[PDB]
Design a protein around this ligand. Sequence first.
Ligand SMILES: NC(=[NH2+])NCCC[C@H](N)C(=O)O
Ligand SMILES: [Mn+2]
Length: 340
Amino acid sequence: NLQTFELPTEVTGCAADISLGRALIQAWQKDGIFQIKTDSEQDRKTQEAMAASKQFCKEPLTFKSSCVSDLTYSGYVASGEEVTAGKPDFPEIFTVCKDLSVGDQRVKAGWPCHGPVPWPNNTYQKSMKTFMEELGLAGERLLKLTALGFELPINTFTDLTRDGWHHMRVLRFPPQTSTLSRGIGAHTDYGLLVIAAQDDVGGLYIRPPVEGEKRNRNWLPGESSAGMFEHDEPWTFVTPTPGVWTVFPGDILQFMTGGQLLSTPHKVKLNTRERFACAYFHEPNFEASAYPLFEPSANERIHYGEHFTNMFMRCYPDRITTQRINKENRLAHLEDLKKY
Ligand SMILES: NC(=[NH2+])NCCC[C@H](N)C(=O)O
Ligand SMILES: [Mn+2]
């Protein structure tokens, strides 16, 4: 059974705040996951986002496929389009990244992944943007409490999430209709926090920390966490529970804390019913460089925007976003943006 916490509206660093940060870290180090209780507005905006999702998914595939961009990875993923560990995942997804128009200087400069969300409609954009502003507030709470539990300056993590690369995967998993029950393969997500909401059907499994088990550093090439431990136990079932979001660490948190926190492996199993979920990613700024918090002398850095772009090219190798990245070689502009 998971732990559920209520976050304070504002995190000031008082002793109850430091206590709470201590407990979240502990929960992460034991269960690899915990729940935060939602208030009425957070819940209402979660239900609106789900309702918008189901509506969008009823639309014919040609319409849904039309919501795609060669500037940004925001938009539609068909069931079967995403690749995990060499195998296609089967949900339909609408990814929402930072919604930047063609009038933004980063977009003008051809920065990779920077571009406008191909929204199906304005009502869907309102619901999604209202949901993510609430998720973002919760992520900043969480990041301040985490740094407090680690006896770090309160702003240690929030300093990297100014204009952060926050994004969300709006997922619809189909019922299991074939021999394959694999919804999404065992993977780790790429930022600091993942905050997820869930319908009543159920199907997400997460892997807790295991003593002495090696966890791949998904930010290195040749240490991809994609597919690791998929058919080895233990795997906790995240029971659908009304009035909560779940939170677990992403790749940046694992790197920065030198493994005190682990980027939680998770997978999804197709159920007898279609299953709706939203996964929110509280990320650093695109130009932020993560650093090891407990090894000052260590030179390792993770330029977060390079990690995001790498990740999203390996998910979507044939998507028009990726083609244009290859065509104009915007990975080179990424190295330029590091220096000029
Ligand atoms: N864009 C994502 N969050 N994808 C999550 C699934 C894992 C992804 N297919 C990978 O290979 O890393
Ligand atoms: Mn995930």
